[PDB]
RNA sequence: GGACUCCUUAACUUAAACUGAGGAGUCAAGUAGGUACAAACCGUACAAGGAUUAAUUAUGUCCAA
RNA sequence: CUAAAGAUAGCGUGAAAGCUCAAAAA
RNA sequence: UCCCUUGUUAUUGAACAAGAUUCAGUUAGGAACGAUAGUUCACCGUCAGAUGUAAUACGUGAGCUGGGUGUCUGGAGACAGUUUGUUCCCUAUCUAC
RNA sequence: UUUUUUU
RNA sequence: UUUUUUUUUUUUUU
RNA sequence: UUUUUUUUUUUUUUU
């Protein structure tokens, strides 16, 4: 507010100017983007699903530069497609960054295919079987240990996401339409299905294995 | 039971690089005041209404404190209560007029005040010390108190304070239980007519319209 | 690993904020859990100097009242020593 | 009624507009002949500056 | 040393500060400001600040300086610029701009003949229309009809066609209040279009080309862009069968303009011509749609190779670089009203066309399929107090929509601005009442697993312990 | 054979309201005003006396005022 | 495809293997 | 965040059991004796109540005292008990011709 | 009764 | 942004 | 970016 600190008063805050230029995490940003840049208007043709976004995202949202939008609507072997005879949307702007937002792709994927995730199971005696029918999920965490009833999660997330298990019962697949929901569900599952670093009996998200450890 | 309460910052972004790092509300998102979906009729607020009376000499001022600041409102109220706005003001006596406040629940507070504010109540020779009550409790139990205390602490510290205080009326709700006093909020009225049409309708060929409808069908 | 400051020690560290009792910054590392840092034990703050006192703190501070009695005194200005004054 | 002057709504006028650094940067780029269509210097595009200057500076003919 | 604060701490707070630098003031305000104007050519704020300073310093600034400042402000918002229409509307909504135009109107009688083309070009650029000066400018234009050059004539015709003034419709070219109307200016652009054709016909007898500025420049100093602009201006008003009475062979003007706008160019140069592509394609599409008497003679002007090239690469850059960019206040207001009225079938910026059409050249503002209606928005200043008019761009759009068979409803800003939220909703409901739904609606909701609809989830459910030994762990 | 503060400076733990020097103000022997609450700081056209009057000062101008 | 690639900056193993970064291309 | 009881589940050279550092609450229930009198400390023996810190004028002397490295019968504050009531002691006497 | 962002 | 939230996380960069 | 400071007697931060 209106009070000088001792560091900034006496010392003058000289610490900030006492750092070394070595042992850095990342290299310095190259100062190449100097005066002499020429901007151009880029345009991209997106599927007709983005129409669900509406005007509240393309016009109401404030931005540094204008963000136009148009909808080319057309009345309705080998899939021989061309640039004519089909509907689409034109999105044009001067900033390429605005033409790469994840929301635009989500608007299409959510209403077309959705999202999915997978969990891998490992360990001796670790099996994920099925009850008579859905929704009733039970997972056995080793030999001699009682199974885990996972019906709560499925009831919570009913109609938003679904869980599938292979014949073997070593893979837990999750399929949904909601990114957030899917992720939440996956992480919820993994929270109680997490594997032990020593015995290595549990579950793990793909492309993120756990490192083994040994006692000294 | 065994952990700290869930604050308002738990349900939103944190921006240390700004004045308002996180928004604070008296209640959760899922707990905010709301209106019943079936409106039996629409209502409109009159902002403020005033009643004079020459015979009895008691004047009334009904205000609508909907989306207003507590401090400002309190400040304004103080003036009226004191009666300083009149020419014939006597500090010895209470020259003010009765004030009615509604929609107290709808008040606002800037900054991190909803989650970092408390109220102390003194105790005569108590070892525990003064009783401390959080503002969320007061909002939950009796919203009117929020304004009441601000006004009270604003009023001069004299023997007249109680008197001035008594004349103050604050309600959480829209309407008031009073009999002989107009309402700030009244049923809506029909909009006024316009002497001009801002549209230019031009129909197309019926044959082409029918052909297009058949094609679309 | 509570620390009084934060630094980027890994190749993929990210400065995040944790929803603890209070808003607290921190550093999370994926390749090494030991590098997880949480700034929650800082040094006590000092009492700052008001701004309005700045004018009378820095720079050459001249005396408030000047000295003139030593350079003002004279015999002619005193009735006890005036008669002794001689201009011839 | 005058007493309750504080409750009145007000809206001052807009003295001047506000623009972003990129918004202002694009203006000089367009003026220099680098509009959205292309490079006017490289090829004479529609609504160019040089042609407009001549035609609007010498519209009348010589007697 | 000593600090300024220290020194100041012993002096009156209201004491004035000495001046370090002093120079003589500017004796001549007009000459002082003329040199300053030379540096401001891209920043609208600089121009506005300079005008404000001059207005504060003098009550009756130089008319030439005022005209130059107005032209400078108009030039910034060019067609090739990246500025949006919202930036023009907010600029028009400023008090200083109103004061500048009022100052021009006060001494409008000091307008020179050579300053009319620049004023019209600035009007076209800023999309601002006035009934206070345009009637006077048209008088000078018509008086000096027999003295303007061909490129100026073409540019004036294009600008007036864009502004929607000078059309052939009767009793639709009058300005001023209803009780005080100015002269009728019906069929104004046709005179320029016939003058250029008459000059072209006479040029053949002389055959004296002489020196040329550039290969693309014609004998008369014309340009293919100017010829394409003339053709587009004619197409906008729909005067396809315009012909010169003096011509014994009865040759259409549009075909001649198209031929002269295409002979100089080649296939390689067409890809970089720019606006010529859009003008040619739009003119050809409109001619094909309306099928005028001169369809055969008009379609033969453009070479087949050029037509194929324009048809193939059209939906990539041509269709997107020749349309408005940015937001729109009037569009947003009606969109909010439609959303309030529970209208989820309206499509913003939607195109339409015939059944056997693979490319659309128009985009309606708010199109609804259930009711088969199109909503158009007009924001130009009306001709007078209660006599609005549709812009030239929307004039041809309405004809195309009528041909396609879609009902059109236009909303005027002058009358829409005079309403509140309640009134606007009332009027919009009344307008919609006249077009009841015909076709079924289309939804684009979220996809979900409907199969699991019968499931129920209990939150506040306590964990059961029937028996000691648990057979299964219940999370 | 003096109490606080301003500049210089001896001693001390660059400590302490200490111990002791050079030259200006105040209190001592000064009223009322400001600084939230108890001489020393700011201001004073500074208290013979009486009355229902006008002023650029330290300094203030959301409420207690 | 062309171009470029430290005697080797950060992981890893039991002596190894393996990955990534710099440079280059786009 | 104070000796024990809480934070299922990633800070650990943490296999289990038994352990070490750090942090968090809406501040919940608990923690036994003796001998020698070297003004208190390392240590010694028992029940294992299970490694058991400071401030408050030595907290506390108009409440009590002991082998040395005085007395005072409570007037006002505070604290702990208690209080019939409009009347049931007395008195309370318009207007004006 | 907020200001600034050269060409 | 979702009651996801004792030291555990997802989505979107507002 | 600025108006809002030890305003640290209380309320209030109404920008």
CSV table of C-alpha atoms in Angstrom, one decimal, chain E residues 220-404:
chain,number,residue,atom,x,y,z
E,220,UNK,CA,-8.6,7.0,-71.1
E,221,UNK,CA,-6.7,6.2,-67.9
E,222,UNK,CA,-9.4,3.7,-66.8
E,223,UNK,CA,-8.7,0.5,-64.9
E,224,UNK,CA,-10.2,-3.0,-65.0
E,225,UNK,CA,-11.1,-2.4,-61.3
E,226,UNK,CA,-13.0,0.7,-62.3
E,227,UNK,CA,-14.8,-1.2,-65.1
E,228,UNK,CA,-15.7,-4.1,-62.7
E,229,UNK,CA,-17.0,-1.5,-60.2
E,230,UNK,CA,-19.2,0.0,-62.8
E,231,UNK,CA,-20.5,-3.5,-63.7
E,232,UNK,CA,-21.1,-4.3,-60.0
E,233,UNK,CA,-22.9,-1.0,-59.5
E,234,UNK,CA,-25.2,-1.7,-62.4
E,235,UNK,CA,-25.9,-5.2,-61.1
E,236,UNK,CA,-26.7,-3.9,-57.6
E,237,UNK,CA,-29.5,-1.8,-58.9
E,238,UNK,CA,-30.5,-4.4,-61.5
E,239,UNK,CA,-30.3,-2.2,-64.6
E,240,UNK,CA,-29.1,-5.1,-66.8
E,241,UNK,CA,-30.8,-3.9,-70.0
E,242,UNK,CA,-29.3,-0.4,-69.9
E,243,UNK,CA,-28.4,0.7,-73.4
E,244,UNK,CA,-27.4,3.9,-75.1
E,245,UNK,CA,-30.2,5.4,-77.2
E,246,UNK,CA,-27.7,7.0,-79.6
E,247,UNK,CA,-26.2,3.6,-80.3
E,248,UNK,CA,-27.7,2.3,-83.6
E,249,UNK,CA,-26.4,-1.2,-82.9
E,250,UNK,CA,-28.1,-1.4,-79.5
E,251,UNK,CA,-25.2,-2.8,-77.5
E,252,UNK,CA,-25.6,-3.5,-73.8
E,253,UNK,CA,-23.3,-1.5,-71.4
E,254,UNK,CA,-22.8,-4.4,-69.0
E,255,UNK,CA,-21.3,-6.6,-71.7
E,256,UNK,CA,-18.9,-3.8,-72.8
E,257,UNK,CA,-17.8,-3.1,-69.2
E,258,UNK,CA,-17.2,-6.9,-68.6
E,259,UNK,CA,-15.2,-7.2,-71.8
E,260,UNK,CA,-13.0,-4.2,-71.0
E,261,UNK,CA,-12.6,-5.4,-67.4
E,262,UNK,CA,-11.3,-8.8,-68.7
E,263,UNK,CA,-9.3,-8.2,-71.9
E,264,UNK,CA,-6.3,-6.7,-70.2
E,265,UNK,CA,-6.1,-9.4,-67.6
E,266,UNK,CA,-4.9,-13.0,-68.0
E,267,UNK,CA,-5.3,-16.3,-66.1
E,268,UNK,CA,-2.1,-15.7,-64.1
E,269,UNK,CA,-3.0,-12.1,-63.2
E,270,UNK,CA,-6.6,-13.0,-62.3
E,271,UNK,CA,-5.5,-14.9,-59.2
E,272,UNK,CA,-4.0,-11.7,-57.8
E,273,UNK,CA,-6.5,-9.1,-59.3
E,274,UNK,CA,-8.4,-9.1,-56.0
E,275,UNK,CA,-11.9,-7.5,-55.9
E,276,UNK,CA,-12.3,-8.2,-59.7
E,277,UNK,CA,-12.9,-11.9,-59.0
E,278,UNK,CA,-15.7,-11.2,-56.6
E,279,UNK,CA,-17.3,-8.5,-58.8
E,280,UNK,CA,-17.2,-10.7,-61.9
E,281,UNK,CA,-18.5,-13.8,-60.1
E,282,UNK,CA,-21.3,-12.0,-58.2
E,283,UNK,CA,-22.4,-10.1,-61.4
E,284,UNK,CA,-22.5,-13.4,-63.3
E,285,UNK,CA,-24.4,-15.2,-60.6
E,286,UNK,CA,-27.0,-12.4,-60.3
E,287,UNK,CA,-27.4,-12.3,-64.1
E,288,UNK,CA,-28.0,-16.0,-64.2
E,289,UNK,CA,-30.5,-15.9,-61.3
E,290,UNK,CA,-32.6,-13.0,-62.7
E,291,UNK,CA,-32.3,-14.1,-66.3
E,292,UNK,CA,-32.6,-10.7,-67.9
E,293,UNK,CA,-33.3,-10.1,-71.6
E,294,UNK,CA,-29.5,-9.6,-72.2
E,295,UNK,CA,-28.5,-12.9,-70.5
E,296,UNK,CA,-26.9,-14.3,-73.7
E,297,UNK,CA,-25.0,-11.1,-74.5
E,298,UNK,CA,-23.8,-10.7,-70.9
E,299,UNK,CA,-22.7,-14.3,-70.3
E,300,UNK,CA,-20.6,-14.2,-73.5
E,301,UNK,CA,-18.3,-11.3,-72.3
E,302,UNK,CA,-16.4,-13.4,-69.7
E,303,UNK,CA,-14.2,-16.1,-71.2
E,304,UNK,CA,-14.9,-19.7,-70.5
E,305,UNK,CA,-11.5,-20.2,-69.0
E,306,UNK,CA,-11.9,-17.3,-66.6
E,307,UNK,CA,-15.4,-18.5,-65.7
E,308,UNK,CA,-14.1,-22.0,-64.8
E,309,UNK,CA,-11.2,-20.5,-62.8
E,310,UNK,CA,-13.6,-18.3,-60.9
E,311,UNK,CA,-16.0,-21.1,-60.2
E,312,UNK,CA,-13.4,-23.6,-59.0
E,313,UNK,CA,-11.5,-21.5,-56.4
E,314,UNK,CA,-14.3,-19.5,-54.9
E,315,UNK,CA,-15.1,-20.9,-51.5
E,316,UNK,CA,-11.5,-20.5,-50.1
E,317,UNK,CA,-10.6,-16.8,-50.1
E,318,UNK,CA,-13.0,-15.0,-52.5
E,319,UNK,CA,-16.1,-15.6,-50.5
E,320,UNK,CA,-14.5,-14.8,-47.1
E,321,UNK,CA,-12.4,-11.7,-48.0
E,322,UNK,CA,-15.3,-9.7,-49.4
E,323,UNK,CA,-17.8,-9.8,-46.5
E,324,UNK,CA,-18.2,-7.8,-43.3
E,325,UNK,CA,-15.9,-8.7,-40.4
E,326,UNK,CA,-16.5,-8.3,-36.7
E,327,UNK,CA,-19.5,-7.9,-34.4
E,328,UNK,CA,-22.8,-6.0,-34.9
E,329,UNK,CA,-24.8,-4.2,-32.2
E,330,UNK,CA,-28.1,-4.3,-34.1
E,331,UNK,CA,-27.7,-8.0,-34.8
E,332,UNK,CA,-26.8,-8.8,-31.2
E,333,UNK,CA,-29.8,-6.9,-29.9
E,334,UNK,CA,-32.2,-8.9,-32.0
E,335,UNK,CA,-30.4,-12.1,-31.2
E,336,UNK,CA,-30.8,-11.4,-27.5
E,337,UNK,CA,-34.5,-10.7,-28.1
E,338,UNK,CA,-34.9,-14.0,-30.0
E,339,UNK,CA,-33.2,-15.9,-27.2
E,340,UNK,CA,-35.5,-14.2,-24.7
E,341,UNK,CA,-38.5,-15.2,-26.7
E,342,UNK,CA,-37.5,-18.9,-26.6
E,343,UNK,CA,-36.4,-19.1,-30.2
E,344,UNK,CA,-33.9,-21.9,-30.6
E,345,UNK,CA,-34.5,-22.3,-34.4
E,346,UNK,CA,-32.9,-19.1,-35.6
E,347,UNK,CA,-29.6,-19.4,-37.5
E,348,UNK,CA,-27.1,-16.5,-37.4
E,349,UNK,CA,-25.2,-15.8,-40.6
E,350,UNK,CA,-26.9,-18.5,-42.7
E,351,UNK,CA,-26.9,-18.8,-46.5
E,352,UNK,CA,-29.6,-20.0,-48.9
E,353,UNK,CA,-30.1,-20.7,-52.6
E,354,UNK,CA,-32.0,-22.6,-55.2
E,355,UNK,CA,-32.5,-26.4,-55.1
E,356,UNK,CA,-29.8,-27.1,-57.7
E,357,UNK,CA,-27.2,-24.8,-56.2
E,358,UNK,CA,-23.8,-25.9,-55.0
E,359,UNK,CA,-22.5,-22.5,-54.0
E,360,UNK,CA,-24.3,-19.7,-52.1
E,361,UNK,CA,-23.4,-16.0,-52.7
E,362,UNK,CA,-25.4,-14.5,-49.8
E,363,UNK,CA,-25.7,-15.0,-46.0
E,364,UNK,CA,-28.9,-13.9,-44.2
E,365,UNK,CA,-28.7,-12.3,-40.8
E,366,UNK,CA,-31.1,-14.5,-38.8
E,367,UNK,CA,-32.6,-17.4,-40.8
E,368,UNK,CA,-35.3,-19.7,-39.4
E,369,UNK,CA,-36.2,-22.9,-41.1
E,370,UNK,CA,-39.3,-23.8,-39.0
E,371,UNK,CA,-41.1,-20.5,-40.0
E,372,UNK,CA,-39.3,-20.0,-43.3
E,373,UNK,CA,-38.4,-16.4,-42.7
E,374,UNK,CA,-35.3,-14.2,-43.0
E,375,UNK,CA,-34.4,-11.2,-40.8
E,376,UNK,CA,-32.4,-8.2,-42.2
E,377,UNK,CA,-30.8,-5.4,-40.2
E,378,UNK,CA,-30.4,-1.8,-41.4
E,379,UNK,CA,-28.3,0.8,-39.5
E,380,UNK,CA,-27.8,3.6,-42.0
E,381,UNK,CA,-29.2,7.0,-41.2
E,382,UNK,CA,-32.7,7.5,-42.6
E,383,UNK,CA,-33.4,10.0,-45.4
E,384,UNK,CA,-35.3,12.1,-42.9
E,385,UNK,CA,-37.4,12.0,-39.7
E,386,UNK,CA,-39.3,8.8,-40.4
E,387,UNK,CA,-38.3,8.0,-44.0
E,388,UNK,CA,-35.7,5.2,-43.9
E,389,UNK,CA,-34.3,3.4,-46.9
E,390,UNK,CA,-32.6,0.1,-47.5
E,391,UNK,CA,-28.9,0.1,-48.4
E,392,UNK,CA,-27.7,-0.9,-51.8
E,393,UNK,CA,-26.0,-4.1,-50.5
E,394,UNK,CA,-29.3,-5.3,-49.0
E,395,UNK,CA,-31.3,-4.2,-52.0
E,396,UNK,CA,-30.0,-7.0,-54.2
E,397,UNK,CA,-30.0,-9.4,-51.2
E,398,UNK,CA,-33.8,-8.9,-50.8
E,399,UNK,CA,-34.3,-9.5,-54.6
E,400,UNK,CA,-32.3,-12.7,-54.4
E,401,UNK,CA,-34.2,-13.9,-51.3
E,402,UNK,CA,-37.5,-13.1,-53.0
E,403,UNK,CA,-36.4,-15.1,-56.0
E,404,UNK,CA,-35.4,-18.0,-53.8
